[PDB]
């Protein structure tokens, strides 16, 4: 199917406790493949998937150089942001950046991304045109003017349409055993009485990859959106993900409820019921 590549970056200042901590990770789809942490004893970008391990020493050298440069730029940016928001030098602040690309099943660019957030709030984003900017506030407008003057969007566009797509294609081929394999969920329904009058039905999805999934309960064929407890999709630690959806049902009405599961690993969406 379609695929994505993303680089995520977080810098967190800590006045009085040294320079900001910088952590960056790279993903293809829902698979972590590279990491860098400035607080590691001798920081280097490290592999986190088997299919990237074959990249040679020069790859890791270049990647590490970029990581350290990005950490330095972020340190400058954090000092600038204090000025832009008239903030004291005493507090901890956060700068986050993501960039990357989505491609279709033919490997063609669907769209590119480059966006930044300060203290957990959107700051400035490259628009889908890869040519213009959306600034969140008057501070970000100052960045926008700077980046317009520097034609920064033009360089980002060139990367996102070129290397981002090309390297993603490479990684997909090198990781074809795993990146191009969907693992369908293993599903079951459990029943837990709460009282004489009601019981919980919990519909489980386990062992699935990628993480995108839809779990819904219906009663008499009607979606039970407001009455369904859905937990966030969560990682198992073996690449796969887990999720459940629960509804509280009147005792005796269990057969009126059906759990519906959609996942790209499933040829057709599944319908499950409690099987006593």
């Amino acid at each position: 199917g379609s695929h994505s590549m993303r680089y995520f970056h977080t810098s967190v200042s800590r006045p009085g406790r040294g320079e900001p901590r910088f952590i960056t990770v790279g993903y293809v789809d829902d698979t972590l493949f590279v990491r860098f942490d400035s607080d590691a004893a001798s920081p280097r970008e490290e592999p986190r998937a088997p299919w990237i391990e074959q990249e040679g020493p020069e790859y890791w050298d270049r990647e590490t150089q970029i990581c350290k440069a990005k950490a330095q730029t972020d340190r400058e940016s954090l000092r600038t942001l204090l000025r832009y928001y008239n903030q004291s030098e005493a507090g901890s602040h956060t700068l986050q950046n993501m960039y990357g690309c989505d491609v279709g099943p033919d490997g063609r660019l669907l769209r590119g991304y480059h966006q930044d957030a300060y203290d957990g709030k959107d700051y400035i984003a490259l628009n889908e045109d890869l040519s213009s900017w959306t600034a969140a506030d008057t501070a970000a407008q100052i960045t926008q003017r700077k980046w317009e003057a520097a034609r920064e969007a033009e360089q980002l566009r060139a990367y996102l349409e070129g290397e981002c797509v090309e390297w993603l294609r490479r990684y997909l081929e090198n990781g074809k055993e795993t990146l191009q394999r969907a693992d369908p969920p293993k599903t079951h329904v459990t029943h837990h009485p709460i009282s004489d009058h009601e019981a919980t039905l919990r519909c489980w999805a386990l062992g699935f990859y990628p993480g995108e999934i839809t779990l819904t309960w219906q009663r008499d064929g009607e979606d039970q959106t407001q009455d369904t407890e859905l937990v966030e999709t969560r990682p198992a630690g073996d690449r796969t993900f887990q999720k459940w959806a629960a509804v509280v049902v009147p005792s005796g009405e269990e057969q009126r409820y059906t759990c519906h599961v959609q996942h790209e690993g499933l040829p057709k969406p599944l319908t499950l019921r409690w099987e006593p």
Partner: peptide
Amino acid sequence: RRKWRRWHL
């Protein structure tokens, strides 16, 4: 692989 260029805020 990562991009080579960036600009501070």
